[PDB]
Amino acid sequence: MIEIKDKQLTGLRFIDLFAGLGGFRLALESCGAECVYSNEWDKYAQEVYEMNFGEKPEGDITQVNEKTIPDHDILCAGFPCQAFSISGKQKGFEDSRGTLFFDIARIVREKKPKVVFMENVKNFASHDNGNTLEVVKNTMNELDYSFHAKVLNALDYGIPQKREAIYMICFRNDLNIQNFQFPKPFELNTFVKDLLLPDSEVEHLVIDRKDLVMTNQEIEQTTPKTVRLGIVGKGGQGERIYSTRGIAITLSAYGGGIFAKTGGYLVNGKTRKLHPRECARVMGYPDSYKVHPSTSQAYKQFGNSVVINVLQYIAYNIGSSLNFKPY
DNA sequence: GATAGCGCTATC
DNA sequence: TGATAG
DNA sequence: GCTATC
Numbered sequence: 146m147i148e149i150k151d152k153q154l155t156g157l158r159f160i161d162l163f164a165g166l167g168g169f170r171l172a173l174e175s176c177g178a179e180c181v182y183s184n185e186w187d188k189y190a191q192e193v194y195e196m197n198f199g200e201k202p203e204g205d206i207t208q209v210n211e212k213t214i215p216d217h218d219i220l221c222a223g224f225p226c227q228a229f230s231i232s233g234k235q236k237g238f239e240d241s242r243g244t245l246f247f248d249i250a251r252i253v254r255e256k257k258p259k260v261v262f263m264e265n266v267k268n269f270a271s272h273d274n275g276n277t278l279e280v281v282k283n284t285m286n287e288l289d290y291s292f293h294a295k296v297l298n299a300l301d302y303g304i305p306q307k308r309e310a311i312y313m314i315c316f317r318n319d320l321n322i323q324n325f326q327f328p329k330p331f332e333l334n335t336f337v338k339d340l341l342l343p344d345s346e347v348e349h350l351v352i353d354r355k356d357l358v359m360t361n362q363e364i365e366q367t368t369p370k371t372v373r374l375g376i377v378g379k380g381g382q383g384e385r386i387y388s389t390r391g392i393a394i395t396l397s398a399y400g401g402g403i404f405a406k407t408g409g410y411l412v413n414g415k416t417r418k419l420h421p422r423e424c425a426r427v428m429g430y431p432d433s434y435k436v437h438p439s440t441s442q443a444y445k446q447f448g449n450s451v452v453i454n455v456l457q458y459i460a461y462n463i464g465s466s467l468n469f470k471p472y
Numbered sequence: 473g474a475t476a477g478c479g480c481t482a483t484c
Numbered sequence: 485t486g487a488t489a490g
Numbered sequence: 491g492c493t494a495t496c
């Protein structure tokens with residue numbers, strides 16, 4: 146992740162809903178905020194959270210009495226996105242994992258925090274003819290908050306990963322916050338090969354499919370895009386090899402394919418998926434972060450996590466706005 | 473749970 | 485008649 | 491992401 150000398154969010158307290166690995170925790174904390182509550186019902190995500198924050202999140206948010214949630218300035222929430230993803234059934238709100246946002250709303254209505262910082266997949270912005278995004282928007286205003294949503298790509302904030310996401314920032318009206326802005330993009334100068342480990346430590350990840358099919362020659366220069374080199378199987382998800390000379394694809398939490406969740410990369414002429422540590426780096430996570438012992442769960446967690454760096458930039462702007470108080 | 477072929481969508 | 489990524 | 495396999 147990036148370093149932020151002056152911490153705008155100093156003095157402000159936040160909530161880590163749908164905690165997961167604690168992406169919003171790492172993002173916010175760096176800006177000076179204090180986390181006063183986290184929630185996560187998955188046994189394994191719970192584990193890693195405790196391995197890194199010495200704490201265990203509260204289970205099922207759908208059963209927590211909002212009156213229980215601690216008072217706070219910023220409510221962070223990257224609720225479930227398997228229902229609006231371009232890779233699923235897209236039943237959205239008509240899905241068991243499709244609601245959850247109404248729990249976010251249920252909590253704001255009772256806690257009225259200065260800011261609501263949310264996150265979800267890019268498709269969420271167009272899902273159901275933009276009507277489902279409109280519902281989040283209308284819901285928020287009803288509660289008396291402005292609404293700033295926007296889809297960003299990590300390949301624009303120094304992270305070599307084609308990971309897109311919708312980011313929705315909400316300010317309370319009584320605060321008349323009018324100068325909020327999303328972080329400006331900038332040239333990427335880090336690529337997949339720059340985050341890899343010594344092939345010595347990942348020889349167990351190597352795979353050799355006699356049905357491997359190269360479809361393009363290795364590139365010379367690096368690029369802020371994903372360059373495919375080959376295909377295995379029918380080339381479906383998890384069956385596509387990319388160059389470490391370009392950037393990394395989206396890391397998925399439930400993706401299948403032989404190169405399940407991370408995708409395939411041609412490393413030293415060796416075909417293989419990424420190591421958990423590498424996924425961490427790809428998500429802008431510090432090496433000091435301890436990954437879950439179960440790798441399947443680890444890929445799964447980084448799979449549906451958030452990129453630290455982008456959150457940091459956004460958190461910074463949230464403070465710069467909250468901190469602009471002229472007479 | 474962990475593994476993997478898949479099979480349909482969105483954007484172009 | 486195509487092509488790639490989720 | 492879904493889902494059948496073990």
Ligand SMILES: Nc1ncnc2c1ncn2[C@@H]1O[C@H](CSCC[C@H](N)C(=O)O)[C@@H](O)[C@H]1O
Nearest residue numbers: 163165166168185186187205206223450451
């Ligand atoms: N009812 C519920 N209560 C608590 N957590 C829930 C939940 N339903 C889904 N979740 C959790 O929602 C999370 C969405 S993933 C969000 C990622 C997270 N902000 C990060 O930085 O990693 C998952 O970890 C899932 O287990």
Ligand SMILES: *OC[C@H]1O[C@@H](n2ccc(N)nc2=O)C[C@@H]1O
Nearest residue numbers: 230265266309310397398448449
């Ligand atoms: O692109 C959808 C696919 O990737 C995972 N994911 C991607 C991007 C964001 N913002 N969140 C995610 O969880 C989920 C899905 O499996």
